[PDB]
């Protein structure tokens, strides 16, 4: 009951740590989808700076 | 004669309480060690439940 209950707890920590890293990977994947959207917006505002009549 | 043969007849019964005690010398010690040999049931159970870990 020490050999069995410890490995059942340690597996259940291991399973719960797997869903934590799976949730944090897809949440961090949602960062770069917004980060490049802000990055390409920074590029497309520079094209407004290039032409003069809309920029002034 | 009478009295000397009677005390030697007692030594048959006087050695019978030694046969009483040797039957509680041997039986006490011999079955303690097969009550020590039941740890082999724990040796086979641990490696069989090691497969449950495996």
From Swiss-Prot, chain A:
Domain of life, source organism: Eukaryota
GO MF annotation: an example: proton-transporting ATPase activity, rotational mechanism
Keyword Signal attached: no
Secreted recorded as keyword: no
Function description: Subunit of the V1 complex of vacuolar(H+)-ATPase (V-ATPase), a multisubunit enzyme composed of a peripheral complex (V1) that hydrolyzes ATP and a membrane integral complex (V0) that translocates protons. V-ATPase is responsible for acidifying and maintaining the pH of intracellular compartments and in some cell types, is targeted to the plasma membrane, where it is responsible for acidifying the extracellular environment.
Protein name in the entry: V-type proton ATPase subunit E 1
Subcellular location: Apical cell membrane; Cytoplasmic vesicle, Secretory vesicle, Synaptic vesicle membrane; Cytoplasmic vesicle, Clathrin-coated vesicle membrane
Taxonomic source organism: Bos taurus
Family the UniProt entry places it in: Belongs to the V-ATPase E subunit family.
GO biological process, one term: proton transmembrane transport
Predominant place of localization: membrane
One cellular-component annotation, GO: apical plasma membrane
Entry comment describing in which tissues the protein is expressed: Expressed in brain (at protein level).
Keyword annotations of the record: Acetylation, Cell membrane, Cytoplasmic vesicle, Hydrogen ion transport, Ion transport, Membrane, Phosphoprotein, Synapse, Transport
Subunit structure: V-ATPase is a heteromultimeric enzyme made up of two complexes: the ATP-hydrolytic V1 complex and the proton translocation V0 complex. The V1 complex consists of three catalytic AB heterodimers that form a heterohexamer, three peripheral stalks each consisting of EG heterodimers, one central rotor including subunits D and F, and the regulatory subunits C and H. The proton translocation complex V0 consists of the proton transport subunit a, a ring of proteolipid subunits c9c'', rotary subunit d, subunits e and f, and the accessory subunits ATP6AP1/Ac45 and ATP6AP2/PRR.
Curated annotation (Swiss-Prot), chain B:
Compositional bias annotation for Basic and acidic residues: 30-50
Tissue-wise expression: Expressed in brain (at protein level).
Compartments it resides in: Melanosome; Cytoplasmic vesicle, Clathrin-coated vesicle membrane
Domain of life according to the entry: Eukaryota
Coiled coil: 3-52
Family: Belongs to the V-ATPase G subunit family.
Described purpose of this protein according to its UniProt entry: Subunit of the V1 complex of vacuolar(H+)-ATPase (V-ATPase), a multisubunit enzyme composed of a peripheral complex (V1) that hydrolyzes ATP and a membrane integral complex (V0) that translocates protons. V-ATPase is responsible for acidifying and maintaining the pH of intracellular compartments and in some cell types, is targeted to the plasma membrane, where it is responsible for acidifying the extracellular environment.
Quaternary structure and partners: V-ATPase is a heteromultimeric enzyme made up of two complexes: the ATP-hydrolytic V1 complex and the proton translocation V0 complex. The V1 complex consists of three catalytic AB heterodimers that form a heterohexamer, three peripheral stalks each consisting of EG heterodimers, one central rotor including subunits D and F, and the regulatory subunits C and H. The proton translocation complex V0 consists of the proton transport subunit a, a ring of proteolipid subunits c9c'', rotary subunit d, subunits e and f, and the accessory subunits ATP6AP1/Ac45 and ATP6AP2/PRR.
Protein name: V-type proton ATPase subunit G 2
Organism listed in the record: Bos taurus (Bovine)
Annotated gene: ATP6V1G2
């Amino acid at each position: 009951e020490k050999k069995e209950k410890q490995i059942e707890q340690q597996k259940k920590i291991q399973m719960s740590n797997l869903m934590n890293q799976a949730r944090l990977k897809v949440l961090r994947a949602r960062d770069d989808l917004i980060t490049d959207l802000l990055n390409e917006a920074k590029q497309r505002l520079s094209k407004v700076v290039k032409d003069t009549t809309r920029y002034q | 004669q009478g009295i000397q043969q009677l005390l030697q007849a007692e030594k048959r019964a006087a050695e019978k309480v030694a046969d009483a005690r040797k039957r509680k010398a041997r039986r006490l010690k011999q079955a303690k060690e097969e009550a020590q040999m039941e740890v082999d049931q724990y040796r086979r159970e641990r490696e069989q439940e090691f497969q449950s870990k495996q």
